[PDB]
Amino acid sequence: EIEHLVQSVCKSYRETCQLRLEDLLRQRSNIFSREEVTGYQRKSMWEMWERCAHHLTEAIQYVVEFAKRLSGFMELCQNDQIVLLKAGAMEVVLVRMCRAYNADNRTVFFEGKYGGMELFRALGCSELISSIFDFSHSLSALHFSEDEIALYTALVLINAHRPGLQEKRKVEQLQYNLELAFHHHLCKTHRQSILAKLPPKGKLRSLCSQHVERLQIF
């Protein structure tokens, strides 16, 4: 039952989405004041990193939970579960971020209110911050439904081309079933148009790099 897989993926996302879409939307009117932005800008680069590291670690935890709830993920050997999540959990976090991005005014939900990219000045990777904002802006243009996000992010994670897989065929089978589910659903809703608009697999990989690794120090 591939319809069972669909329903399961969608439930797992609903249970682990971290922030409810209705709360994210309702809070769009809530914008960081100039004094609050200045307050963030005054923080040490080190403090901004530890705050961001904390929030990212928390977000990853929920992505791992999501994976553990996917029918068949738990059937994979432990080595492969680790390989897939090590490679893909942060990629899913970056995709999930688009829900918390408001294209109207180019702001992102951060610690309870919406702010623009200048809020993150203290991080000192303004090229990186700009790329994250641009990526989120690109995804927001797709107007993902919750279920499309569920199925798309499951496929970000369940990718049989990750180096180091011990049971590649098992992962291929799971990935293919999930692709069938996704493509079938998009076809029944006339949403085929989004596939061509998704970021190339290389874009997500490129963004998910040297900056977000070795955060143990934080």
Ligand SMILES: Cn1ccc2c(S(=O)(=O)N(CC(F)(F)F)c3ccc4c(c3)CCCN4C(=O)c3cccs3)cccc21
């Ligand atoms: C605009 N925007 C919104 C949120 C936010 C935060 S955050 O702290 O709310 N946040 C944690 C989470 F969203 F998961 F909850 C977050 C987001 C991005 C990043 C990080 C954390 C770590 C820094 C870099 N960094 C990244 O490069 C990446 C992480 C994962 C893939 S790339 C930081 C920076 C820009 C942000």
